Amino acid sequence: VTPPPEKFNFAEHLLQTNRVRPDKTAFVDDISSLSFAQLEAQTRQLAAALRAIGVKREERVLLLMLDGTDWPVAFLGAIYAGIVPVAVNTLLTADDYAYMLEHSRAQAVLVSGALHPVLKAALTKSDHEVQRVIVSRPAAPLEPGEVDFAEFVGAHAPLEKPAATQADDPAFWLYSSGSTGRPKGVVHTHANPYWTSELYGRNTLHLREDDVCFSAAKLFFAYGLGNALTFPMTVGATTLLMGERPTPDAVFKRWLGGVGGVKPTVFYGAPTGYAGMLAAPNLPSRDQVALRLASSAGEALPAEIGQRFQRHFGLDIVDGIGSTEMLHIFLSNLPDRVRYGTTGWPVPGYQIELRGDGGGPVADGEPGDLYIHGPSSATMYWGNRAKSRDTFQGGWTKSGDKYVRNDDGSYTYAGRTDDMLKVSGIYVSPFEIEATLVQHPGVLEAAVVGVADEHGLTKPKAYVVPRPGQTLSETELKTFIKDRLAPYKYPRSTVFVAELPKTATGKIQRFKLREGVL
Ligand SMILES: Cc1ccccc1C(=O)O
């Protein structure tokens, strides 16, 4: 793969790629579609609009939007202007967004109507610098000074040229949380999504122009941003976008061509989703779908789910691993070489090392900490030099995973270095779940660990010491956590215990809870 030039604006790159196919559909959702020409026009009109309201090159804007055709307009339009969109998870709290507004010093916000109430609370509470709120598909009346996204875009002529950025200039941020502390601003450059899209999208997956891409993973996830924006636009594929929560039924409707007159050929999702669909009584038959490639990430794929999928559809599930910091997948099975029980082989262009307790070598078959050297690495966590030092170790990026290398050169997952769980395809901190449980007045103590379910997928499990003299039922606790945690964070079970295993300092011995001592 040829490196991108030094003068490179990633948005311009994707637009120029598709000037050969102006009338092909670029994006379609439940209510709208954009051809590549339409996407270009709206992108460049947005870029002008953000400049007209005073947002300058290198300044941030918050992009808080459901998957839909306005999403790539927002993302690429900022980047075309040389403005840095901060693309964020749509299921967070107003407090999370308040922190992000302050930390990013976002100058404007692009927000879905459905997300305007949480955003409004974030604005009200924070010491932000937001000059304008631009609302895509408003669900309530606009407040004074707010603007409808379609009017904002429509009222401005297209920007005539892109910002003259460098390949290594920041292009956009994603946020990533660790087991404690605030979300970290992962800073990606213009070059980074070129590299993922070429090394993985084109050269590993072999995506092509006649593909229709559909990702259960939303656009704000690094995984989904590649799958459903950077990858398809690199090759000229059409992409289907869905605003709603993925369920088996929602995914099947789309697989069957229920939206936009298109049937996906490439699907992407998490192993939990694949398990859910395979359990669904109305799982479509092979002859009803146009799938040629199924990608998986977000948690280790249990071999049985891949094997069952292949028995049913005649398609393997291609499981790979990436990180937010590396932008996309660097270690993967291949469409024509799958070894279930493994994450496959290093992606050409990326070097992988396993390091032991001193940074030393680990013998094949022994677990080490995974480090990656490749050209799509983020540069830093913005404003966090200490965590930057820990993760970005001189050309090598630490992922937080442990792995074993097998005799065939494949790699098998061996857990985390940082207490995080990967549940339903998403990172969740046990300490967050514990923090929520102990605020119930009936709970004295709580410890949360990962447990494999009947399909071998990790789900949280809570061990709770009740407070003497209160009452506390499992169902009381279910109701308490309902609206305090996202549903993927719900413990799959709660065990009430009289005490937890601890050191003499009171540190919970979590390892004993995984080993079944209770
Ligand atoms: C965390 C992540 C980011 C980009 C692509 C894949 C992954 C993963 O979940 O393995």
Supply the DSSP string of 4-28, one letter for each residue: PPSB--HHHHHHHHTTT-TTSEEEE
Instruction: Pull the structure tokens for residue 263.
Output: 């049937």
Q: Ligand 1 pocket test: pick from 188, 223, 230, 426 the residue with the most ligand atoms within 8 Å of its Cβ.
A: 223
If DSSP codes are grouped into helix, strand and coil, which group holds residue 245?
coil
CA 11/CA 72 separation, integer angstroms? 10
- Calculate how far, in angstroms, residue 313's C-alpha sits from the geometric centre of ligand 1: 24
Strand partners, 446: 464
- Ligand 1 closest atom vs CA 270: 9
Nearest CA-CA partner of 309 in 344, 334, 275, 336: 275
133, containing H or E segment: strand 132-136
DSSP string, 452-500: E-TTS-EEEEEEEEEPTTS---HHHHHHHHHTTS-GGGS-SEEEE-S--
CA 33/CA 239 separation, integer angstroms? 10
CA 214/CA 250 separation, integer angstroms? 12
Q: Ligand 1 pocket test: pick from 220, 329, 332, 427 the residue with the most ligand atoms within 8 Å of its Cβ.
A: 329
CA 54/CA 489 separation, integer angstroms? 40
10 Å Cβ neighbour count for 301? 30
If DSSP codes are grouped into helix, strand and coil, which group holds residue 34?
strand
- Calculate how far, in angstroms, residue 139's C-alpha sits from the geometric centre of ligand 1: 32
CA 219/CA 112 separation, integer angstroms? 13
CA 149/CA 152 separation, integer angstroms? 5
Contact 364, 407 (CB under 8 A): yes
Instruction: Pull the structure tokens for residue 242.
Output: 């869905």
Residue 441, judged by CB atoms within 10 A of its CB (0-12, 13-18, 19+), counts as exposed
Question: Pairing state of beta strands 25-28 and 238-240?
Answer: parallel
Nearest CA-CA partner of 265 in 242, 238, 236, 298: 238
Q: Which residues of 198-207 are buried (b: 16+ CB within 10 A; e: fewer)?
A: bbbbbebbeb
Going by alpha carbons, the residue nearest to atom 1 of ligand 1 is 323
Domain covering 317-428: architecture: Roll (2.30)
305 φ, ψ to 5°?
Answer: -70, -45
Sequence length of the chain is: 518
Per-residue CA distances from 236 to 14, 36, 198, 229, 432 (Å): 9, 9, 13, 10, 41
Q: In the chain, what are the domain boundaries?
A: 1-241, 242-316, 317-428, 429-518
DSSP string, 69-122: THHHHHHHHHHHTT-EEEE--TT--HHHHHHHHHHHT-SEEEEEGGGHHHHHHH
Class of 242-316 per CATH?
alpha beta
Nearest CA-CA partner of 297 in 197, 190, 225: 225
Contact 444, 496 (CB under 8 A): no
DSSP string, 319-381: EEEE-TTT-SEEEE-BTTB--TTS--EEPTT-EEEEE-TTS----TTS-EEEEEE-TT----B
297 lines ligand 1 (CB under 6 A): yes
Instruction: Pull the structure tokens for residue 422.
Output: 């990967």
Contact 456, 302 (CB under 8 A): yes
CA 76/CA 20 separation, integer angstroms? 18
Class of 429-518 per CATH?
alpha beta
* DSSP, res 269: E
- Ligand 1 closest atom vs CA 425: 9
CA 181/CA 161 separation, integer angstroms? 40
* DSSP, res 142: P
What is the rounded radius of gyration, in angstroms, for the C-alpha atoms of the chain? 23
Contact 320, 363 (CB under 8 A): no
If DSSP codes are grouped into helix, strand and coil, which group holds residue 433?
helix
Strand partners, 133: 109
- Ligand 1 closest atom vs CA 321: 10
Nearest CA-CA partner of 24 in 12, 38, 43: 38
Instruction: Pull the structure tokens for residue 341.
Output: 């029980």
Q: Helix axis angle, 248-255 relative to 271-279, nearest 10°? A: 80
10 Å Cβ neighbour count for 408? 8
322 lines ligand 1 (CB under 6 A): yes
Question: Pairing state of beta strands 170-176 and 411-416?
Answer: unpaired
C-beta contacts of 252-259 below 8 A and 24+ residues apart: 252/277, 252/280, 252/282, 252/283, 252/284, 254/214, 255/214, 255/284, 255/288, 255/289, 255/290, 255/291, 256/284, 256/288, 256/289, 257/290, 259/28, 259/29, 259/30
DSSP string, 143-177: PTT-EEHHHHHHTSPPPSS----BTTSEEEEEEE-
Nearest CA-CA partner of 513 in 454, 465, 444, 441: 465
Strands across the sheet with 493-496, in order? 443-452, 458-466, 493-496
CA 130/CA 54 separation, integer angstroms? 11
* DSSP, res 301: P
Contact 227, 211 (CB under 8 A): no
Q: Which residues of 359-378 are buried (b: 16+ CB within 10 A; e: fewer)?
A: eeebeeeebbbbbbbbbbbb
CA 463/CA 503 separation, integer angstroms? 17
Task: Judge whether 394 is annotated as a binding position.
Answer: no
Task: Judge whether 320 is annotated as a binding position.
Answer: yes
CA 495/CA 481 separation, integer angstroms? 15
Nearest CA-CA partner of 327 in 173, 215, 436, 458: 173
CA 64/CA 136 separation, integer angstroms? 10
Per-residue CA distances from 419 to 44, 309, 391, 447, 499 (Å): 43, 30, 15, 12, 21
Strand partners, 319: 296
Q: Helix axis angle, 36-52 relative to 10-17, nearest 10°? A: 150
CA 103/CA 328 separation, integer angstroms? 24
CA 224/CA 170 separation, integer angstroms? 20
| Amino acid, single-letter form, for residue 441 | P
Contact 57, 174 (CB under 8 A): no
Nearest CA-CA partner of 326 in 411, 232, 392: 392
Nearest CA-CA partner of 2 in 227, 167, 205: 167
Nearest CA-CA partner of 11 in 158, 131, 199: 158
Contact 61, 86 (CB under 8 A): yes
Tokens 């071998």 -> residue? 456
Strands across the sheet with 266-269, in order? 33-35, 25-28, 238-240, 212-215, 266-269, 293-296, 317-322, 329-332, 345-346
Q: Ligand 1 pocket test: pick from 221, 325, 411 the residue with the most ligand atoms within 8 Å of its Cβ.
A: 221
Task: Judge whether 357 is annotated as a binding position.
Answer: no
> Domain 1-241 falls in which CATH fold?
Rossmann fold (3.40.50)
- The reply to whether domains 1-241 and 242-316 share a CATH topology is yes
CA 475/CA 288 separation, integer angstroms? 41
196, containing H or E segment: helix 191-196
40, containing H or E segment: helix 36-52
